Amino acid sequence: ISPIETVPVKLKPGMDGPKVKQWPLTEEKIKALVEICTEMEKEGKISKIGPENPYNTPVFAIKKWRKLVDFRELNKRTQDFWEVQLGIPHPAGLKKKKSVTVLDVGDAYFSVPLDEDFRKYTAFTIPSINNETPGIRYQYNVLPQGWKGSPAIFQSSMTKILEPFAAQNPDIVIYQYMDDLYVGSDLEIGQHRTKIEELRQHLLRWGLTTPDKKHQKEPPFLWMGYELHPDKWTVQPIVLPEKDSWTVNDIQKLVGKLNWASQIYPGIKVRQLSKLLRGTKALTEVIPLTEEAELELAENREILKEPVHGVYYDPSKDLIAEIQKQGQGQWTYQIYQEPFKNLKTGKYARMRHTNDVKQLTEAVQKITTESIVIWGKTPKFKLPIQKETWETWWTEYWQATWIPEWEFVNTPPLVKLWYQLEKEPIVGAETFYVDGAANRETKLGKAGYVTNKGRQKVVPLTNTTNQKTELQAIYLALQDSGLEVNIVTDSQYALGIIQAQPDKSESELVNQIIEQLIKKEKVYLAWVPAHKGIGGNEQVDKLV
Amino acid sequence: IETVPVKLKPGMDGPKVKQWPLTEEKIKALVEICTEMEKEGKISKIGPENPYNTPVFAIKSTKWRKLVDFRELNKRTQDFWEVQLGIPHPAGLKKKKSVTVLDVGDAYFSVPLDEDFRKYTAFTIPSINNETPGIRYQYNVLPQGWKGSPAIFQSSMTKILEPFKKQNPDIVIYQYMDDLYVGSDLEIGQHRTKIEELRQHLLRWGLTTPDELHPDKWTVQPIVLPEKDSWTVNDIQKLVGKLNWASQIYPGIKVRQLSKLLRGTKALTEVIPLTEEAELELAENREILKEPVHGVYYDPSKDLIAEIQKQGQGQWTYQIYQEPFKNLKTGKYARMRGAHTNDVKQLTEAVQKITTESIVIWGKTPKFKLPIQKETWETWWTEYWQATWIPEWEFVNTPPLVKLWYQ
Ligand SMILES: N#Cc1cc2c(Oc3ccccc3OCCC(=O)N3CCCC3)cccn2c1
């Protein structure tokens, strides 16, 4: 226990403590329990109690033995607390120190006192053999294992205990994490060990044991799935399994390790490997490794072959981020201050059918958010797009977009606008009046056009939708026209898709239309109300 | 002095909103501001038994100002502290020639805050890279941005303002959160002097303020049909399409005489003279659209919705409505900065201008449908925010095919 002041705690509004029942337990267990509760009572962590306490909580025992108290019922009744840290610090954002020491406090929660007026609700009962002698009543004086309050209270106690030491030692950096401390310094190694030894003495005066140099751990460090080395970091070694049959569960785990590895191994792809999991319900259904997925899995194995490492942060050097396109809504980026070492890497994939420039902007945004979290600043951007390309797109795009400080990098693939529609209709160009229509029941439909020069066509269509025929019409007019064409449609849908100027889509039709749009020289698309008898349009809806 | 007790709506628990990550520069500025505030008693540090939280920001001038987003605590409290302690909105403020906004938030900081309420004002200064859990405070005095603050202070305010109101029975003064809106009909020169009089009145009564709108033009702008010498088939098609979209708001538009004027499947650049029967519709429809709509009344029990559209070359259009197609106000914000402005700066000024107009006209702010990617806005909006309130907002998914229909 410790002379730390207690944090006051309340039960949830309108509620009383847990009055659960203790199921009878076997004989050799009832023995090994009291062999713990007499030791814990001696050390002041518990205290036998009278009959006046009406609450109780179950207690179990499990492999020397070990005591265990299911607090899940009391956890449902205690007030809520400030949430402990959700995320953890990222290695790419530590600043190099001359020396780092790792200290872990034992019996952590038991070394911290529990608020007095709340100790009653922790009562428990060791049962008598053959349910006869009254039960041995108890209760906690310290932070019980697995209680809702214990982590947040321990955190702030530790934080308060560190205060008098941090004030006498402003040159040294302590990180808190659950039950660890990570102490860094730029002191010469003899000074550093003395400071560590006087930190431990301080923490010992407040009732917190820590390991001596006989067991104070040493680089490299295996922390939360990383390998932290004196002047570099990497992920802990990844193991991609080789199986002939792959379960839905197993694909998830594989995508996990692949995402995990992507923070430092550049160029991991996960598009095809998770397209698999798109239609998932059952966790155990075996899935065929499609051909495209198997290629990506093989290419990831290639990248993971040789290890690679990241560096740590230096605040005096610039922060640079560089972006490359991978090919199918797939993007990869590196963050660095030096030309042969990265701070970290990662990927952006777009779900939901955009174009390259829109996607590039979303990737810049993701990186900006991440930079801020990790370093507290935004990087300069090196981007594979010409300024004039980009000024053209953002000036005409319906959304507002922020373009940060960036400069062009001439590494293919470049990001470009592939075609552009016209702003006003073309002269000396044939004017096609297209329309289309289907039947929701039969899935039969037709697409056709009518031109000002009296040309006409109608094509039959099976297995289609009013949406798909309206796009089919526009494809027809693009097929049967010259290098300049005016198209006139009564469909805001099809007008929406093309005016968005995509360069790829998850529907094969829209891809063919994009090809024609590249081939053509000037294409003006124009819109009129359907079924309003405008003229030109009234004659094509009749045909279709 | 005695504290006004403050209760939440029954069954409503306190705010638990997540704190955004911030620049190191913003973090440091906040740590400075809060170190002085703890020093003057205005706020105090709290333990983990306080679970509530409310986001905080840093904005500007050259001083960093701190800005607490109290939107969630406002819904959970002031919605009963607009009934129990409401401040009535004067319908004659929109009529005055000149309206000046004066910041009086500094008055609240003397007055203590109800002891049992302080827990719900918790906020966190965040740390970079999750190094530390965060620095946690709660208010001991009435906070800026909380709507219950000027509610509680309203009696003091009505008292300090009463001598000024007697010598100036023609000057309307409305309090909305931290600001006094003051409207006169005086010439600009007299009104300005009259503003300095009220500054000096407030300053000799112990309210410092750290130191112009014309709600005469404020209306629903009329729709503009293009004025053309000659008309082509494409022009008639754009005209027929716009006029058909207007029929949803101004019923009584007629187009049959205009549709006949494109009877055969002509080419798209073919000029077609307008018939007399055609020019009759264009004239008869240009007049039914210069006159305002019928049936369009503000409902105080509904929420105002603002929609903004980007238009090009620093021009933005907006409409404020409660029901589709019944616009209570429309306008056009144009930022003149000479390519020293980007879209995000312009959208931010637009939102602030629309919100102030909405405050003057109705005493309420709208919820904005913003044409911008969410994370982009969540990252840069504070860069140009100058107001002390924050409207509610959300993000538009699909573009408008109705773009030039408001230009
Ligand atoms: N197990 C573990 C572990 C260690 C650290 C950690 O070390 C630091 C502690 C205090 C200041 C800077 C630090 O890191 C400096 C960067 C550095 O040169 N190194 C060398 C090996 C460890 C990192 C910080 C955060 C989490 N930790 C988790």
Swiss-Prot record, chain B:
Effect in UniProt of substituting residue 177 to I: 54% loss of polymerase activity according to PubMed:9533880; increases polymerase activity according to PubMed:9657675. No loss of RNase H activity
Phenotypic consequence of residue 180 to I: 29% loss of DNA-directed DNA polymerase activity. 46% loss of RNA-directed DNA polymerase activity
Annotated effect of mutating residue 179 to E: Drastically reduced incorporation of phosphorothioate nucleotide. Loss of pyrophosphorolysis (reverse of the polymerase reaction). No effect on RNase H activity
Effect of residue 177 to V: 58% loss of polymerase activity. No loss of RNase H activity
Stated consequence of mutating residue 67 to V: No loss of polymerase activity. No loss of RNase H activity
Residue sites binding Mg(2+) 1 per the record: 103, 178-179
Impact after mutating residue 241 to A: Complete loss of polymerase activity. 25% loss of RNase H activity
Residues the record marks as site: Essential for RT p66/p51 heterodimerization: 380, 393
Consequence of changing residue 179 to N: Loss of pyrophosphorolysis (reverse of the polymerase reaction). No effect on RNase H activity
Effect of residue 146 to F: 10% loss of DNA-directed DNA polymerase activity. 22% loss of RNA-directed DNA polymerase activity
Span of domain Reverse transcriptase: 40-213
Record note on what altering residue 377 to L does: No effect on RT p66/p51 heterodimerization
Mutagenesis or variant effect for residue 146 to A: 73% loss of DNA-directed DNA polymerase activity. 70% loss of RNA-directed DNA polymerase activity
Known outcome of mutating residue 160 to V: 70% loss of DNA-directed DNA polymerase activity. 64% loss of RNA-directed DNA polymerase activity
Annotated effect of mutating residue 178 to N: Strongly decreased RNA-directed and DNA-directed DNA polymerase activities. No effect on RNase H activity
Effect of residue 385 to L: Decreased RT p66/p51 heterodimerization
Effect of residue 243 to S: 17% loss of polymerase activity. 30% loss of RNase H activity
Effect caused by changing residue 149 to G: Complete loss of polymerase activity. No loss of RNase H activity
Short sequence motif named Tryptophan repeat motif, residue ranges: 377-393
Consequence when changing residue 389 to L: No effect on RT p66/p51 heterodimerization
Protein name, as recorded: p51 RT
Organism encoding this protein: Human immunodeficiency virus type 1 group M subtype B (isolate BH10)
